[PDB]
Design a protein around this ligand. Structure first.
Ligand SMILES: N[C@@H](Cn1cc(Br)c(=O)[nH]c1=O)C(=O)O
Ligand SMILES: N[C@@H](Cn1cc(Br)c(=O)[nH]c1=O)C(=O)O
Lengths: 260, 260
């Protein structure tokens, strides 16, 4: 009937501007895991779509005062977009206002260190102060620590929320740059699949250490009651069962890995 | 309003008969990961329930001729039970007839060998014939191979469906017993979390080898349109975010591990 508005976010390798995007237009301007996923979802659900980058560049959180939802979640809640296809974490608070398909990717919070840093776990981080550590300034990773009642994670949150200077960063790129330029005095807490991706990128000076702190997944989101919800959910299950999601990860993570 | 009928299956350590069940009655007769999960789900959703073991002892498949659904899926489809709480895999074909909550456990098909067996991957298995291998005779693991278009898995299915004697087993216990009693001439393909569980059970003679063949999850199921669906889904997300699901796995898998 009508072209579906897809909201997504510039997060490598999910969505990236093609080198020669200027010579291109529309959906052809972008490339990445979620760009490929969107094409597959649309084909299996039978709809035409337009890729758009979330206006405020955020994932989705609710302001405690205004009660307004920002980010991709907000665009769905307010009808500015019809579906969100990005590394958007399935969480309780979001599930209450929008619908999520079954997960297309499984992950967990993990630790990124510059090679050589004497840290092997969250426990290690929480028991020392020489090495600073933080998370993305907004998102499920930060919220995980803020709301955690688990001893170690609660101790980590207490340190992070009051640390000076700030240990929180605006983007993944900033967190990675901080790890790489801090001579081992900064460790970054981020979602495991991103940690895995960066570990295979030059200058190959970072690595994931320890096990994941939690377990969760990314899901495709639609406004509550959307007529696209059901088909999208089944499409995700079909793509996973056919092994296409596994193929996409290899395509964007390892096939072109730069660290051997 | 009315007591919720919960259908589940006798699969250790999800649901097991307590040693002194005779002296007990009702829900108290059972113990296990899913027994604990059911209590948590009911508490968070505010309902009273009765645990029942699926009549035909199956998970859920559709007969191609009669079109009738068997197992736990069947009990939901036909209204014999109101909710299924067990290690039930979220699959496309099932999602089409019943509703699934977001996953409460992530897993994948894996290889179980008796210690010392010269096999490290699915590739290894597919390229030889001395060592037989099979799966549970019904369920998502068998279906995975039957429907797989991936070269290695397709080759494995071709061998398994025609192997003599049969390499398929009726229950997990039978598969494990066959691995343990075949002197390394039988390898068992099963869901990873079960493989992990058995590896920590006496006589400690089995082990998981290689990476998982796929990625998926178990979900709580309800009849399509059930008024319990929404609350149950949010309950699962809440329990995971609070770290309770992680605690339950440790309780039933490692806290009482028998292999050191
Ligand atoms: N997926 C998160 C966003 N997000 C992303 C990355 Br990458 C990370 O390391 N941490 C996060 O919270 C959300 O949905 O808020
Ligand atoms: N979870 C499956 C059943 N199931 C269980 C175990 Br344990 C296994 O090794 N393989 C399966 O197919 C389903 O839902 O069919």
């Amino acid at each position: 009937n009508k072209t579906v508005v897809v909201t997504t976010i510039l997060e490598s390798p999910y969505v990236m501007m093609k080198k020669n995007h200027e010579a291109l237009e529309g959906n052809e301007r972008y490339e990445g895991y979620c760009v490929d996923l969107a094409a597959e979802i649309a084909k299996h659900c039978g709809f035409k779509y337009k890729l758009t980058i979330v206006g405020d560049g955020k994932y989705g959180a609710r302001d405690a005062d205004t009660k307004i939802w920002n980010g991709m979640v907000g665009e769905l809640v307010y009808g500015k977009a019809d579906i969100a296809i990005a590394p958007l974490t399935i969480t309780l608070v979001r599930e209450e206002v929008i619908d999520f398909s079954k997960p297309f990717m499984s992950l967990g919070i993990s630790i990124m260190i510059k090679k050589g840093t004497p840290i092997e776990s969250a426990e290690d981080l929480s028991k020392q102060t020489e090495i600073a550590y933080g998370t993305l300034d907004s998102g499920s990773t930060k919220e995980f620590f803020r709301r955690s009642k688990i001893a170690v994670f609660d101790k980590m949150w207490t340190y992070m929320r009051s640390a000076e200077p700030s240990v929180f960063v605006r983007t993944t790129a900033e967190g990675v740059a901080r790890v790489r330029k801090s001579k081992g005095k900064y460790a970054y807490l981020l979602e495991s699949t991103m940690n895995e991706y960066i570990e295979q990128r030059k200058p190959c000076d970072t690595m994931k250490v320890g096990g994941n702190l939690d377990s969760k997944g990314y899901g495709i989101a639609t406004p509550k009651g959307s007529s696209l919800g059901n088909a999208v959910n089944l499409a995700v299950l079909k793509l996973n069962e056919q092994g296409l999601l596994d193929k996409l990860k290899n395509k964007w993570w390892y096939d072109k890995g730069e660290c051997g």
